[PDB]
RNA sequence: AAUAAAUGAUGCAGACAGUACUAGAU
RNA sequence: GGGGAACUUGAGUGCAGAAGAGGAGAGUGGAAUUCCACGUGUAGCGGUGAAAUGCGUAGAGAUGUGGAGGAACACCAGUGGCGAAGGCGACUCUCUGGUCUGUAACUGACGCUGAGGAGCGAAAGCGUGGGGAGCGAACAGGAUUAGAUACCCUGGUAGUCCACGCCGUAAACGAUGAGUGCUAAGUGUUAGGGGGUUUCCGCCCCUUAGUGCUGCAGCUAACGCAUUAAGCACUCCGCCUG
């Protein structure tokens, strides 16, 4: 069942951050790979790798702690839940903490962040926030 | 036991090793429900067996709905073969 | 598979005991219950008292029937005075 | 009651010494002494889980 | 790290609650003092004190607050981003405001924000109105704030890369 | 202590074993506890079954 | 020739007010 | 989201095993209580804080034998086990439900929840016909108290039991809805599996589902919870607004 893979992915990442872990294993769907690569290019993660196996495929995430003891991903939160979908327009694209954070948004042309969607003049599902 | 199942399997086997066979599971559930009602017609107070029969019937109904949504031809064939009316 | 063990009253001659044994065996075979094994412990002192005796003859029989000659043997032993106690168990 | 075993060639209290010790392994002190007044099934069940574990006896 | 108390401070009390202890003889009354000490350059702290006298309790609370100072970002005389504190059933949100809005908050939160040097903040309490918990939640929310340059250094990016 | 059935690798008690049932039952007739006999839970349950069947078949006493 | 530590179950005690009562300031 | 085509991890079938107070039905059992009959046998028996009501010289209690009948199943027995919940504890048998272990052979999303509805549903209670050993509301008597329509004692109806039907309520509680995923540890325990020497007995490690205690982070008003969450998240249902 599980009703959604993305929310559980985000919560697993949040628990990993809370415990100060260094690795994770996820069934690694296409959208999950996309979000992980976005976080990678955003500096939230040290490195990410894909493991295409026979069962479904697996992805490993390496949490980032650039300094002595600091959680890069302080918190996460999903919005477009399965039962209350959220769609934001180009003019209503939000910004996380005055542009300090980042929010993932699937748009008409690929999956992009808030700033990328604002630049490209698009909009769609606001499926997650990041702080 | 170990005879009715084997016969139903050999009868409803579409392939050499087809044992998932929603039709086979339906036939097995039907024969089990019949054997259960046989004794429930006398031990009317065994409510736990009635709950088990309700569970089996729910499984049967879900399988029948799946088969109807998947292949109406095979659904109607199973109907004509078993008489599950 | 099934197992049958029963107790015969002690005050019985050898010929009468054998006659009763054959009678009950025939009763069991009334449906075709093959007797796959037999054992006679003999004279053993009972741990506790029964109707009129402290000892008796123990008889063991192995059977593979359809649970009908079992009931026949049960209702016959409960009625007949030759047997005092008896129990049928599955050898599974 | 302790047992049916007999002992002789001792004193009067030497027998009671072993009586009071062997009576522990019999229900004469528990089984025949608890059932003086009724106990509800609930408390009846909880009494075992309490005593047999806490080792209060 | 711990901030030194060697600075000019505008120590200002909030409330003085009178508590009583019951004894064989009767009730023994003591005074509890809440005080907020800080400067208007981004450093503030909270302390408390108890004694049978008002001035002694005030002095003890001031001395304790001196040892519990904390730093707060002052991006544009305001906070870099909104945040909420949730210390002990006390929920208080803090939003950044323009240059002319002013400090808007209930007594204790307003005092804490003023003594910290912030002039334009939007606040709203969404929980208990107890002053201790109010101050604690405000302090927690201010501690959970992050600077733009700090976040840029942490995420291995440039300030402009984040602000645009 | 050490269990008997495990040490011997034996199978179903075969209640006919009057000597085993006797030496495993108290001198009075009461069933000895597991903490004293050293047997496992499964073997203790089988022991109870066997001793009950024996008592039913006059192979062991009820009272002594 | 020696020599044992026990045993325990206590009967009775109902009510008390309507209105009353201490503070403290950088 | 709809339609089309593939996949197994979800889901289910089979394969070889495992435990269990799982249920309905039939038979059997020996302790123990009561009564009856008889042999021995006298002045008491039973009971309370004390006492009395009660039974006993038409011969009690006690002791020993036999019989009659009815309920429950000592020791095993252990936060042990099963069941969706209530609940389920002697033995034997007939008919039956679910669960766990390696599943990989099989179908390949067939899954979760579920208003309304149906069914089940402690004890008590009601109706029909039986049965009634002990216990025992109501009731009678004897005590205490100022009073006792009670707490104590002696008797004692219905009830407790059996077949059918009805009622559908409990502190029916873990005062914690169902499903899934993630989140340090030590620790016993039930039924299994694999292994590192041993044929073993047994020691250790690993791995499944369940049952218990102490405890990190985290949560919480605190109490406390903490891989069986009251932690971190998603889906559905019922409920709350002095």
From Swiss-Prot, chain A:
A Gene Ontology molecular function term of the record: rRNA binding
Q: Which domain of life is it from?
A: Bacteria
Q: Name one cellular component (GO) term.
A: cytosolic small ribosomal subunit
The record's keywords, sorted A to Z, are: Ribonucleoprotein, Ribosomal protein, RNA-binding, rRNA-binding
SUPFAM superfamilies per the UniProt record, alphabetical: Ribosomal protein S8
InterPro entries tied to this protein = Ribosomal_uS8, Ribosomal_uS8_CS, Ribosomal_uS8_sf
Q: Which Gene3D superfamilies match?
A: 3.30.1370.30, 3.30.1490.10
Gene Ontology annotations of biological process type: translation
Keyword Nucleus part of the UniProt annotation:
no
Please name the PANTHER family in this protein's record: 40S RIBOSOMAL PROTEIN S15A
Family label: Belongs to the universal ribosomal protein uS8 family.
The free-text function statement in the UniProt record for this protein reads: One of the primary rRNA binding proteins, it binds directly to 16S rRNA central domain where it helps coordinate assembly of the platform of the 30S subunit.
Subunit composition?
Part of the 30S ribosomal subunit. Contacts proteins S5 and S12.
| Protein name per its UniProtKB record | Small ribosomal subunit protein uS8
The top of its lineage is: Bacteria, Bacillati, Bacillota, Bacilli, Bacillales
Swiss-Prot record, chain B:
Alphabetical list of SMART domains matching this protein: Ribosomal_S15
Q: Which InterPro entries match?
A: Ribosomal_uS15, Ribosomal_uS15_bac-type, uS15_NS1_RNA-bd_sf
- Check the record and name the CDD domains matching this protein: Ribosomal_S15p_S13e (cd00353)
Stretch list, region Disordered = 1-21
Please name the GO terms that the record assigns under molecular function. rRNA binding; structural constituent of ribosome
Q: Which UniProt keywords apply?
A: Ribonucleoprotein, Ribosomal protein, RNA-binding, rRNA-binding
Do you know which Gene3D superfamilies this protein is assigned to?
6.10.250.3130, S15/NS1, RNA-binding (1.10.287.10)
Q: Which PROSITE patterns match?
A: RIBOSOMAL_S15 (PS00362)
Where in the sequence does UniProt note compositional bias of the Basic and acidic residues kind? 1-18
Which biological process terms from the Gene Ontology are attached to this UniProt entry? translation
What NCBIfam families does the entry give? S15_bact
Q: How does it assemble?
A: Part of the 30S ribosomal subunit. Forms a bridge to the 50S subunit in the 70S ribosome, contacting the 23S rRNA.
Q: What does this protein do?
A: One of the primary rRNA binding proteins, it binds directly to 16S rRNA where it helps nucleate assembly of the platform of the 30S subunit by binding and bridging several RNA helices of the 16S rRNA.
| Family indicated by similarity | Belongs to the universal ribosomal protein uS15 family.
The protein's name in its UniProt record: Small ribosomal subunit protein uS15
Provenance organism: Bacillus subtilis (strain 168)
Swiss-Prot record, chain D:
| Segments forming a coiled coil | none
Q: Does the keyword Amino-acid biosynthesis apply?
A: no
Any one of the GO BP annotations: translation
Q: Does the keyword rRNA-binding apply?
A: no
State any single GO MF term.
structural constituent of ribosome
One of the record's GO cellular component terms: ribonucleoprotein complex
Q: What Gene3D superfamilies does the record tag this protein with? A: Ribosomal protein S8 (1.20.5.1150)
Keywords attached to this Swiss-Prot or TrEMBL record, sorted alphabetically, are: Ribonucleoprotein, Ribosomal protein
InterPro entries hit by this protein = Ribosomal_bS21, Ribosomal_bS21_CS, Ribosomal_bS21_sf
Xref: PANTHER family = MITOCHONDRIAL 28S RIBOSOMAL PROTEIN S21 (PTHR21109), SMALL RIBOSOMAL SUBUNIT PROTEIN BS21 (PTHR21109:SF22)
Q: Which family does it belong to?
A: Belongs to the bacterial ribosomal protein bS21 family.
Record HAMAP family: Ribosomal_bS21
Give the protein's recorded name: Small ribosomal subunit protein bS21
Gene name, please?
A: rpsU
Swiss-Prot record, chain F:
Stated induction or repression of this protein's expression: Strongly expressed during exponential growth, decreases 2-4-fold in stationary phase, part of the rpsF-ssbA-rpsR operon. The operon is induced by DNA damage by mitomycin C.
Q: What does UniProt give as GO cellular component?
A: cytosolic small ribosomal subunit
A GO MF term: small ribosomal subunit rRNA binding
- Isomerase as a keyword of this entry, yes or no, is no
| Keywords tagged on the record | Ribonucleoprotein, Ribosomal protein, RNA-binding, rRNA-binding
- The residues forming the signal peptide are none
Does the record carry Ribonucleoprotein as a key word? yes
S-S bridge residues:
none
Which GO biological process annotations does it have? translation
Report which residue ranges the record marks as coiled coil.
Answer: none
Function according to Swiss-Prot or TrEMBL? Binds as a heterodimer with protein bS6 to the central domain of the 16S rRNA, where it helps stabilize the platform of the 30S subunit.
Q: How does it assemble?
A: Part of the 30S ribosomal subunit. Forms a tight heterodimer with protein bS6.
Similarity comment: Belongs to the bacterial ribosomal protein bS18 family.
Name of this protein: Small ribosomal subunit protein bS18
Show the taxonomic lineage: Bacteria, Bacillati, Bacillota, Bacilli, Bacillales
Name of the gene encoding the protein in the UniProt record: rpsR
Segment of the intact protein contained: 14 to 77 of 79
